[PDB]
């Protein structure tokens, strides 16, 4: 499996599994899962009441020093009752490593803002307000960042349509750019592309 | 002429020969000015001044449950009892059996392809009939 297959990094896998055990046993109040991917990325799935105590740990602890917040992300998964999956990506420049801190909320439960840990989060979770509708409590300036000013709805939710509900055009009667319900001259064509044969037997879920 | 919708053009309850009620779904919309059929009847009732107590398809199906409650329980065969009572009722009139033989109207494959107004308008059914009649 040399030329076309990605080489497995067992050293980093062992080190990240050990540090995942380390974080899981220092903070058992909030750590719910710890997993390491086959391409060696550590995920620490925590409880949403421990957003600040976990992230302040990894930023400040001398065996962690995750001083950089690379990215902050939500993922809409509507089949869960807590549909939004808040993803922190952290970079330790000291130990040359990356960690992922995952948590969850629904539309109505607020998540605590992590600007007290990473000021970088000030826009990112604000984008999570704009795109997903997740509210962040004790945020300095929480408002929209990317959508238009009168925009109704949160676009990256998966029940939100691809084109929106409204569209703009200039109207010379009122001398104004106006919004109207969206009509497309050509509809977006939906492609059912998924093959009915199982692609990956390792990821098979057990039946009912 | 009141142009209506076809079975691919409306959500619509059809009941098969075993009693199972089943709903179609709107695949395409009716062409031109043609509308859904009960929409036409309901609009005719409102023009005539004898307006009917339904506006949406769900209210039509509430009416349809009022008339018989098994026309809204879809993909369900509701069992029908009381064979003995219909047997007792059928003995009242002594209707005579005619001497004509039992002949079904569809004897060969020639008679199968064109039965209703969709199949008679179908050029594929026309080629099937032309293929089996030679």
């Amino acid at each position: 499996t040399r030329p076309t297959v990605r080489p497995r990094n067992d050293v980093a896998h062992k080190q990240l599994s050990a540090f995942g055990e380390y974080v899981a046993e220092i903070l058992p109040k909030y750590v719910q899962q710890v997993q390491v991917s086959c391409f060696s990325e550590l995920e620490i799935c925590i409880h949403p009441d421990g957003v600040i105590p976990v992230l302040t740990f990894l930023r400040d602890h001398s065996n962690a020093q995750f001083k950089s917040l690379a990215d902050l992300t939500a993922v809409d998964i509507p089949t869960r009752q807590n549909r939004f999956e808040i993803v922190y990506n952290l970079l330790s420049l000291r130990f040359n490593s990356r960690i992922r801190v995952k948590t969850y909320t629904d539309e109505l439960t607020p998540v605590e803002s992590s600007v007290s840990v990473y000021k970088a989060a000030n826009w990112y979770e604000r984008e999570i307000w704009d795109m997903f509708g997740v509210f962040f409590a004790n945020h300095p300036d929480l408002r929209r960042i990317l959508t238009d000013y009168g925009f109704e709805g949160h676009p990256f939710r998966k029940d939100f349509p691809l084109s929106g509900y409204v569209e703009l055009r200039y109207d010379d009667e009122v001398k104004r750019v106006v919004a109207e319900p969206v009509e497309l001259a050509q509809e977006f064509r939906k492609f059912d592309l998924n093959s009915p044969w199982e692609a990956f037997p390792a990821y098979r879920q057990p039946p009912e | 002429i009141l142009p209506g919708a076809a079975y691919t053009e409306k959500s619509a309850t059809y009941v098969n020969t075993e009693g199972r009620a089943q709903q179609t779904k709107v695949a395409v919309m009716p062409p031109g000015l043609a509308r859904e059929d009960w929409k036409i009847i309901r609009a005719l009732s409102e023009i005539a001044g004898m307006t009917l107590p339904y506006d949406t398809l769900d209210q039509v199906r509430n009416r349809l449950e009022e008339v018989s409650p098994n026309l809204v329980r879809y993909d369900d065969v509701e069992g029908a009892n009381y064979f003995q009572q219909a047997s007792e009722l059928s003995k009242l009139v002594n209707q005579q059996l005619l001497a004509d033989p039992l002949v079904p109207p569809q004897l060969t494959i020639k008679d199968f392809y064109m039965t209703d107004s969709i199949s008679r308008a179908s050029q594929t059914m026309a080629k099937c009939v032309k293929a089996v009649t030679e």
């Binding site: 009752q81 539309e107 709805g153 029940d159 349509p161 | 779904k25 709107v26």
Partner: protein
């Protein structure tokens, strides 16, 4: 305490930005999609799907393209169980109808049945 008690029904229709016409006139359909009979694979029958009723698609006068005015005409949602899809429809105020999962009932397969002594289940050729 730090936890409140809300015994109301979960409803978020005022927060999703969806207009009224695309909440209270749409019929979501919650269903396991059937296997394509062009194929024998069954990986597309594994999850539940939520779609909506089809609205009018008309002809573009310039090109003949399929013009639509339904924003929800391409929205297909994936759910692991029936109850998750029902909860997501009820949460968004979508009136829905549910079709039960139609698994194929198990068959009785015997290769020797093709060559029986007295039964009609012989194959006339192989």
């Amino acid at each position: 305490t730090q936890l409140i008690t809300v015994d109301e029904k979960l409803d978020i229709t005022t927060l999703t930005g969806v207009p009224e016409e695309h909440i209270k006139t749409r019929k979501a359909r919650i269903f396991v999609p059937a296997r394509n009979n062009m194929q024998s694979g069954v990986n597309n029958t594994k999850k539940w799907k939520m779609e909506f009723d089809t609205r009018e698609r008309w002809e573009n006068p310039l090109m003949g393209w399929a013009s639509t005015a339904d924003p929800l005409s391409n929205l297909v949602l994936t759910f692991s169980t029936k109850e998750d899809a029902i909860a997501f429809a009820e949460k968004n105020g979508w009136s829905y109808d549910v079709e039960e999962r139609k698994v194929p009932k198990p068959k009785s397969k015997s290769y020797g049945a093709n060559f029986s002594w007295n039964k009609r289940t012989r194959v006339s050729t192989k």
